[PDB]
């Protein structure tokens, strides 16, 4: 990993800290604004979606992308969380009630064997079961995102490639002529992320960010994006 | 099946005469500016790019999304196509070649079983193995074109569900907050179309439009024009 401090400017414009990572999946190469940060550990958060929905996909709780998840009838504080999700618009909207349902029919057993088998971040399971990436033990820092990521993009998880297919479709948030962006934002604690790539014809662009959160985010990460050439 | 007259305008405010199919998947109900043409029966051309992936695809013939296809090193008109393709690039630039060399390499047996299967069209083949769906024999309407995108979409066709998922990813050409389209242009020598769908939060809406073509940005400006309309995108 090549370390870049120029890229600090972006963060300081908009007067927040954090760290980006990029990887040229090409090259095979790193790059960060903030080497140490870059390997500090945090909360999973709103990343956590992804593996919590290729365990759930893997384990059949979840059968497909169009499986629908009736709204339990609580009316909570987002509005887009009252209605009736499948895998997609979960994702899309970062509807957390139905991640939690998918950590209860889990369970703790296989949920842990299951991080063991991604080598994901520290393994920590320690927390409620349907809160412990939001509340608990569990860590893990942007280079460590990034290697799991690239399995993932590779299928070369311990899961079937089916669940990351499927996965890798609902992760979709853009995609025009230039490239396509698979990375959904969340709802975050302290430390938010942007966790995901950019596909271009001739190469993939494997990032992941996390900012200090006394808006911007994707903002940011698109930023340092421009600047290397990886999208205008 | 209703039809709607006033989609002609958008066909005639650029001089030009065509057909646009939509389907609502919900609503289970089809819409269209042309009964009769919708009905029409064509050359698939660059639409047959699908078939032809999915056949090729579940026949081993290409293995996934990453197998390279190298060029043969015959420089052709066409910039985009003098370089190595995967089955993404392939479709994003209508890569004639490529598709030649699966339709040689499933040969003409296989390939005749699969349109039976598929229920694809005339399901006629007749004309060279690598030129026919722009050349010779074969012929689908737009009506036939959305019952067969909808079994695709619904992993209901005969082939692997595997084959199917990565046929559409390729088809992958626009999303955004709004909406995702999986659709391609092509190049089509006699009849252009545009055929695809609209994935939305709630729903899908199938389109497939063909247009007499212009002597030589015109297919997806206007079917665009049609879905703005019925508030399908903004």
Partial sequence: ???????????????????????????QQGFTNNLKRANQAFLPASTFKIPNSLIALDLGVVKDEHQVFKWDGQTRDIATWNRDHNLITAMKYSVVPVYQEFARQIGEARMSKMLHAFDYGNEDISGNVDSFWLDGGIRISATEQISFLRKLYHNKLHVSERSQ????????????????????????????????????????????MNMDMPGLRQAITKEVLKQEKIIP
């Fill in 1 to 27: 990993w090549q370390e870049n401090k120029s890229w600090n400017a972006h963060f300081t414009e908009h007067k927040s800290q954090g760290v980006v990572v990029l990887w040229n999946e090409n090259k």
């Fill in 165 to 208: 297919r499927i996965v890798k479709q609902a992760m979709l948030t853009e995609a025009n002529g230039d490239y396509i962006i698979r990375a959904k934002t969340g709802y975050d604690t302290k430390i938010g992320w942007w966790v995901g790539w950019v596909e271009l014809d001739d190469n993939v662009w494997f990032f992941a």
